[PDB]
């Protein structure tokens, strides 16, 4: 399944940027849980703004507006 | 010759805390956002730059969750992070319970 | 010869492109001309705090051309600001270095 | 087709404050976005002071109050001064 | 001069679901606040939706989307199924 | 001149379709408030005042009283799983708190 | 005014604590919690006075403080708006 | 032993009264506003609407603070827990 491609060393890199020294082996399968739910919650909104406008490709602006709605704004792709 | 356990973990902090590059592989994350999407609307298409704005937002969320998690482990006398730490951080920020 | 309203305020930013923007966010009613001249100069004036505080960064690294690993490594370091931009991640901006005092060797 | 952005004004301000310097095409995306975001906060919030007082028209004294709700600390005290100068120059020439 | 409130429609709806029951005045102010908070959130989101798509009007779909963003869960698919009764009856 | 039949009764709703139109126009909206979009908006307002009163009197009954005082809101609005998400932002004045002792602080 | 934050007397902080579900309160919680409450009051009454100054009123009114709360993500139901 | 402190929990989680004395809180809010402007007058309902929001913030913070004391295997809450609950919350 495609979620297992968020590989163990990738979680370690993300964690290392965040500043943690030593990682329990239970954190790998638990962290995937929080990434999987976070993507679920912004893709619902991005596909909602898509279905509204009748087009059927998700644009960068759609994921920008979805992220903006939930208080997790990004400057980068179009404010 | 071989370093002490601990030496290389602090070497990695000073590396990945100085670069700004993306940490998850492209294709494996691109497969994941397609699978989560097709459960809500069949036969989507994504613009090439939409999935990038997903990735740059995800990494910046994960990295923030760990930064707030380590604060819990440090408070609880440990240095190792464990699931019980994430469940505390994520409850005070009001996400899950 | 037409003047421009930017010059009468003394501003670099477009005082009449604003006004037209505000007139599209307005209930069903109008917007005073003296609003565009303190609407602008309270958007300029964040520039020359967002840019400007990069004196403390770009020049210090001996590199020309502001790039996204700056603004980050500044906007999240000066702290009268930060509050204005908490709501925003900077794409391709990384994070400031730390390491907490209990993880480093004792 | 064509799009409007603040791309030229930020460069024109950059050259006012760091003459030797420039700014990447990746960094322009950010600045243009920061400028849009602060604009939409001020303009979107200014509508509400017009509702709360049941006034029709958006006005300088109204915007002045929006940029002391939306700005923290000493940053507000400077923006409020700077914009007042700009209006005083405009109204002295019309 | 008149002050205007939703106070009668919440009472009318209470007698729809609990015919014996009532509300204290202090517990009316809660509904009279709540019901206009959800008004504003729908108006504000529907307004932005029209703007992003550079429309001027706000037809039914400009609101059905604003409800399908703003409501959390089963409440979205219920409220959408409820509002599509109302307009379907109205247009007869 | 054939009497009148209010837009509420035509829709099938107890909420005021006319009043809400005149509220939407002259909200922070753009300059065109279609009339079918005040019916799919009285509905998706009245539906909460069912789905949130239905369960509240449902608990005034259980405490054996007649009139829904303010805490009976809190004990639903911050107890039903979907309402707790819709109303995160809301403090119910005089509403009290949902009672709970942490399972680790009780002895034996 | 003199020193009126001392009027959040120790027992009252214990009542608030008791509602919140805590058993044992170290003696340093009292002087910390006054610090948290004074910072919260400052950041809401400043907004409430700026809503007042806009309307040329002198009297601060309930809607001013409710609008002040509403913008910080801390909406209050009970006083209108 | 250790039971009467627990008997208070079951009391204050049933009542919905305001827990701070009214006049002492009202005189504090008059103090804090003077450095924003001299000679305000406060409407009698404004002072109440502050109190209702304060108590609801304080008691939310003690709910979120206790969770940290449990995390450290303690029972007693301490300032380092309030500090954590505010830092992780983003105050």
Tab-separated table of N, CA and C in Angstrom, chain D residues 45 49 65-66 68-73, chain G residues 40-54 60-61 63-73, chain H residues 32 36 50:
chain	number	residue	atom	x	y	z
D	45	UNK	N	-11.449	43.321	6.756
D	45	UNK	CA	-11.765	43.668	8.131
D	45	UNK	C	-12.338	45.066	8.219
D	49	UNK	N	-16.072	47.336	10.448
D	49	UNK	CA	-16.287	48.562	11.189
D	49	UNK	C	-17.376	49.431	10.558
D	65	UNK	N	-8.118	52.540	11.886
D	65	UNK	CA	-8.483	51.687	13.006
D	65	UNK	C	-8.234	50.211	12.678
D	66	UNK	N	-8.503	49.772	11.459
D	66	UNK	CA	-8.049	48.455	10.975
D	66	UNK	C	-6.541	48.166	11.143
D	68	UNK	N	-4.793	49.448	13.475
D	68	UNK	CA	-4.365	49.218	14.827
D	68	UNK	C	-5.080	48.045	15.506
D	69	UNK	N	-5.921	47.336	14.786
D	69	UNK	CA	-6.344	46.017	15.222
D	69	UNK	C	-5.386	44.974	14.664
D	70	UNK	N	-5.062	45.021	13.371
D	70	UNK	CA	-4.337	43.942	12.713
D	70	UNK	C	-2.826	43.952	12.957
D	71	UNK	N	-2.254	45.083	13.436
D	71	UNK	CA	-0.813	45.210	13.665
D	71	UNK	C	-0.490	45.167	15.155
D	72	UNK	N	0.559	44.393	15.548
D	72	UNK	CA	1.004	44.351	16.938
D	72	UNK	C	1.914	45.494	17.343
D	73	UNK	N	1.934	45.784	18.646
D	73	UNK	CA	3.050	46.451	19.308
D	73	UNK	C	3.504	47.764	18.668
G	40	UNK	N	-4.064	38.258	29.527
G	40	UNK	CA	-5.272	38.102	28.743
G	40	UNK	C	-6.151	39.366	28.757
G	41	UNK	N	-6.380	39.987	29.927
G	41	UNK	CA	-7.173	41.204	30.058
G	41	UNK	C	-6.600	42.334	29.202
G	42	UNK	N	-5.279	42.534	29.237
G	42	UNK	CA	-4.660	43.559	28.434
G	42	UNK	C	-5.005	43.341	26.967
G	43	UNK	N	-4.821	42.131	26.444
G	43	UNK	CA	-4.977	41.904	25.016
G	43	UNK	C	-6.441	41.899	24.548
G	44	UNK	N	-7.434	41.899	25.437
G	44	UNK	CA	-8.813	41.991	24.997
G	44	UNK	C	-9.322	43.403	25.238
G	45	UNK	N	-9.060	44.026	26.384
G	45	UNK	CA	-9.563	45.371	26.660
G	45	UNK	C	-8.877	46.391	25.738
G	46	UNK	N	-7.667	46.159	25.227
G	46	UNK	CA	-7.097	47.055	24.237
G	46	UNK	C	-7.946	47.075	22.973
G	47	UNK	N	-8.287	45.893	22.421
G	47	UNK	CA	-9.196	45.841	21.280
G	47	UNK	C	-10.540	46.506	21.611
G	48	UNK	N	-11.122	46.231	22.769
G	48	UNK	CA	-12.396	46.808	23.150
G	48	UNK	C	-12.337	48.312	23.250
G	49	UNK	N	-11.261	48.881	23.735
G	49	UNK	CA	-11.162	50.315	23.699
G	49	UNK	C	-10.971	50.816	22.268
G	50	UNK	N	-10.209	50.167	21.381
G	50	UNK	CA	-10.134	50.636	19.982
G	50	UNK	C	-11.459	50.581	19.228
G	51	UNK	N	-12.322	49.588	19.462
G	51	UNK	CA	-13.683	49.607	18.942
G	51	UNK	C	-14.498	50.768	19.508
G	52	UNK	N	-14.264	51.140	20.763
G	52	UNK	CA	-14.939	52.263	21.383
G	52	UNK	C	-14.464	53.569	20.757
G	53	UNK	N	-13.156	53.776	20.624
G	53	UNK	CA	-12.634	55.033	20.128
G	53	UNK	C	-13.113	55.307	18.711
G	54	UNK	N	-13.350	54.256	17.925
G	54	UNK	CA	-13.803	54.450	16.562
G	54	UNK	C	-15.169	55.118	16.532
G	60	UNK	N	-17.516	52.159	27.343
G	60	UNK	CA	-17.302	50.857	26.710
G	60	UNK	C	-18.573	50.038	26.834
G	61	UNK	N	-19.002	49.367	25.756
G	61	UNK	CA	-20.267	48.652	25.783
G	61	UNK	C	-20.094	47.171	25.465
G	63	UNK	N	-21.190	45.181	23.275
G	63	UNK	CA	-20.889	44.735	21.924
G	63	UNK	C	-19.424	44.960	21.560
G	64	UNK	N	-18.805	46.009	22.114
G	64	UNK	CA	-17.401	46.305	21.859
G	64	UNK	C	-16.523	45.163	22.344
G	65	UNK	N	-16.742	44.694	23.570
G	65	UNK	CA	-15.978	43.583	24.113
G	65	UNK	C	-16.341	42.288	23.393
G	66	UNK	N	-17.562	42.090	22.963
G	66	UNK	CA	-17.873	40.897	22.212
G	66	UNK	C	-17.203	40.878	20.830
G	67	UNK	N	-17.152	42.017	20.121
G	67	UNK	CA	-16.406	42.097	18.858
G	67	UNK	C	-14.904	41.904	19.097
G	68	UNK	N	-14.389	42.446	20.221
G	68	UNK	CA	-12.999	42.273	20.610
G	68	UNK	C	-12.669	40.795	20.800
G	69	UNK	N	-13.501	40.059	21.505
G	69	UNK	CA	-13.308	38.634	21.664
G	69	UNK	C	-13.439	37.908	20.337
G	70	UNK	N	-14.389	38.292	19.480
G	70	UNK	CA	-14.737	37.516	18.296
G	70	UNK	C	-13.568	37.416	17.315
G	71	UNK	N	-12.703	38.455	17.270
G	71	UNK	CA	-11.585	38.480	16.341
G	71	UNK	C	-10.383	37.652	16.765
G	72	UNK	N	-10.302	37.279	18.048
G	72	UNK	CA	-9.191	36.490	18.580
G	72	UNK	C	-9.477	34.980	18.603
G	73	UNK	N	-10.562	34.519	17.961
G	73	UNK	CA	-10.959	33.117	17.981
G	73	UNK	C	-11.650	32.690	19.283
H	32	UNK	N	-6.723	48.019	34.389
H	32	UNK	CA	-6.004	47.660	33.181
H	32	UNK	C	-6.396	48.564	32.003
H	36	UNK	N	-4.772	52.415	28.485
H	36	UNK	CA	-5.234	52.571	27.113
H	36	UNK	C	-5.956	53.900	26.875
H	50	UNK	N	-16.674	40.342	30.059
H	50	UNK	CA	-15.273	40.024	30.313
H	50	UNK	C	-15.167	38.829	31.262
